[PDB]
Design a protein around this ligand. Structure first.
Ligand SMILES: Nc1nc2c(ncn2[C@@H]2O[C@H](COP(=O)(O)O)[C@@H](O)[C@H]2O)c(=O)[nH]1
Ligand SMILES: [Zn+2]
Ligand SMILES: [Zn+2]
Ligand SMILES: [Zn+2]
Length: 245
C-alpha cells in the first residue's frame, strides 16, 4: 500500500488491541517521541527509499512472487536467504515478542510488523515475478497513466478523496471478515501471502483492456478496502498474541 493504506491498517488494529498489548505497544512507541501505530506504519517504505544499507537489504521484505507457482509458497524457491515478506514477517514477529531485547530493538520490529502485515494483504505484493508485482503492467486509469501495482497501492483508494478521519470509519462500517480463530505468527504469513496471491490471479484483476476507469474501481476498490480491514484485524490479532500476555 501507499502511506494512507498503511496508516489505515494500523488505525483499524490500534482500536482492537487488548489492554496488555496496548500497554506494551505504547511503551515501545514512547521510546520515540510522538510516534503512533499509524505514524510508524509507512516507515519501512521511507527506510527503503533513504537508507542505502538496511533500506536496500530490506527491499525484498515487502513482497513475494508466487503467482507463477499458482500461489503455493516454498521458502527455498521464492525466498532463499529469507529476503521476502513471508520470512521477514515471521522473523520480525519473533523479535517483537522477545522480552530479553531493548524497547528500541522491539520498536524497530514493531515498525516492520505493522508495515508487512499491511503489505502481505495487498494482492500485487504476492503476484508475478514476471511483471514485478504489476509494476511492469502499465495502464491508463481515467485520463492518467499508471501501473497495476500503483493502482492497488493507492490509485483506487485515492478515488475516495478521504483523509484517514473519513476513510477509517468507512473501513470500520464493513461487515466483520471471518478471521482465523487464533494467531500463529510462524504459519499465518504464508497463509496470508497465498490468499493475497489468489486475489492477484482472480478473473479481471489483470484487465483485458489497457484503458480502465469507473467499472474497474467499482468492482475492485471494495476488494482493496476489504483487504485493508482484514489486514487491520489480522495485525491486531497478531499484536494481541505476540504482546498480549
Ligand atoms: N510482488 C512484487 N512487488 C514488487 C516487485 N518489485 C517491487 N515490488 C513492489 O512494487 C512497489 C514499487 O516497487 P519499487 O519501484 O519501489 O522497487 C513496492 O510496493 C515494492 O514492494 C516484485 O518483483 N514483486
Ligand atoms: Zn505498502
Ligand atoms: Zn506496493
Ligand atoms: Zn512496503
Amino acid at each position: 500500500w501507499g502511506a494512507q493504506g498503511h496508516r489505515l491498517v494500523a488505525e483499524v488494529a490500534d482500536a482492537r488491541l487488548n489492554p496488555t498489548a496496548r500497554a506494551e505497544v505504547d511503551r515501545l512507541l514512547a521510546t520515540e517521541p510522538d510516534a503512533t501505530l499509524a505514524s510508524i506504519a509507512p516507515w519501512a517504505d521511507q527506510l527503503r527509499a533513504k537508507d542505502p544499507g538496511l533500506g536496500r537489504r530490506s527491499a525484498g521484505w515487502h513482497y513475494v512472487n508466487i503467482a507463477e507457482d499458482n500461489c503455493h509458497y516454498e521458502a527455498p524457491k521464492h525466498c532463499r536467504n529469507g529476503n521476502c515478506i513471508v520470512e521477514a514477517l515471521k522473523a520480525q514477529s519473533t523479535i517483537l515478542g522477545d522480552r530479553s531485547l531493548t524497547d528500541g530493538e522491539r520498536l524497530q520490529a514493531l515498525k516492520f510488523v505493522v508495515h508487512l502485515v499491511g503489505d502481505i494483504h495487498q494482492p500485487m505484493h504476492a503476484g508475478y515475478a514476471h511483471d514485478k508485482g504489476g509494476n511492469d503492467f502499465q495502464l491508463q486509469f481515467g485520463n492518467r497513466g499508471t501501473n497495476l501495482h500503483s493502482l492497488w497501492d493507492s490509485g483506487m483508494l485515492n478515488t475516495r478523496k478521504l483523509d484517514d478521519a473519513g476513510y477509517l470509519p468507512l473501513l470500520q462500517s464493513q461487515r466483520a471478515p471471518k478471521l482465523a480463530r487464533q494467531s500463529n505468527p510462524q504459519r499465518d504469513p504464508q497463509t496470508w501471502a497465498e490468499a493475497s496471491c489468489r486475489i492477484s490471479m482472480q478473473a479481471g484483476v489483470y484487465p483485458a483492456t489497457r484503458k480502465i476507469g469507473d467499472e474497474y474501481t467499482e468492482r475492485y476498490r471494495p476488494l482493496a478496502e476489504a483487504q485493508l480491514r482484514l489486514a487491520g484485524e489480522n495485525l491486531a490479532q497478531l499484536l494481541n498474541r505476540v504482546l498480549g500476555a
